[PDB]
């Protein structure tokens, strides 16, 4: 999950050579689906990504405090000063064919939280387990190996 209420599992993992990559050589650690943003109408998840990208470059942590004078344009100007595109879009090349992507990818660091829920603690499959003493129907629960 993010700090923004975005939560998602991992779809799949790729290695460096298979991920897309910026001309500068950075590869993203993580990729998410654009369709998350418009429906959920979380802009902060974007803004943070940008602001962080500046804090990353300049070496000064950013102030996200809720009610302040910090404005998007202000950030964009700061970022442009470091020579990246001012909105955080960045040109990426496909991993497989090493060809530029006709679209540019919004790209940058963001802060993420791993969550308690882990697939290993969840998955279970029962065929012919133990039965409850009372109803002689399969027991309840994973730890008890129920159905």
């Amino acid at each position: 999950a993010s700090r923004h209420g975005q939560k998602g599992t991992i779809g799949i993992t790729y290695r460096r050579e298979d991920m897309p990559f910026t001309a500068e050589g950075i590869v993203p650690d993580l990729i998410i689906n654009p369709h998350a943003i418009p429906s959920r109408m979380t802009v902060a998840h974007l803004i943070e990504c940008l602001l962080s990208k500046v804090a990353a470059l300049s070496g000064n942590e950013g102030d996200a405090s809720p009610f302040t004078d910090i404005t998007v344009e202000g950030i964009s100007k700061l970022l442009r000063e470091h020579g990246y595109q001012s909105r955080g879009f960045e040109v990426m090349y496909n991993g497989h064919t090493g060809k530029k992507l006709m679209a540019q990818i919004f790209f940058g660091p963001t802060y993420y939280q791993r969550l308690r829920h882990m697939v290993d603690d969840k998955i279970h499959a029962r065929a012919r387990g133990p039965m409850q003493v009372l109803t002689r129907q399969p027991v309840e629960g994973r730890s008890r190996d129920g159905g």
């Binding site: 050579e17 298979d18 991993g95 497989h96 064919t97 290993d120």
Partner: protein, 112 residues
């Protein structure tokens, strides 16, 4: 827990051939070569070459699913020209090009 061993990405399987050549019925003189324990790195390389050859009609490849590392490569040529032969030619081309690059590079490196 169920993560397959990482080495299965490259180590050849038990009694599992490097290639498989299956003639395809739908189109004539066309054949599909499955590779084992390979991915884009090798795959896309060839196909580019296969398209340089005038005498090769159709060449494409796909990794059918990212988990397993294998892919299929389909070649089709004009009559009287063995697709396998075409693939041999493409390989001999690449190996040449690389060896040239190595020579040229080390050459450029010594001048530093």
């Amino acid at each position: 827990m169920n993560a397959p061993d990482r080495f299965e990405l490259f180590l050849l399987g038990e009694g599992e051939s490097k290639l498989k050549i299956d003639p395809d019925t739908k189109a004539p003189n066309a054949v599909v070569i499955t590779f084992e324990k390979e991915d884009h790195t090798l795959g896309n390389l060839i196909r580019a070459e296969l398209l340089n050859d005038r005498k090769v009609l159709f060449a494409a490849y796909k990794v059918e699913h990212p988990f397993f590392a294998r892919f299929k490569l389909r070649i089709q040529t004009t009559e009287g020209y063995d697709p396998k032969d075409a693939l041999k030619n493409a390989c001999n081309s690449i190996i040449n090009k690389l060896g040239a690059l190595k020579t040229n590079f080390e050459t450029e490196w010594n001048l530093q």
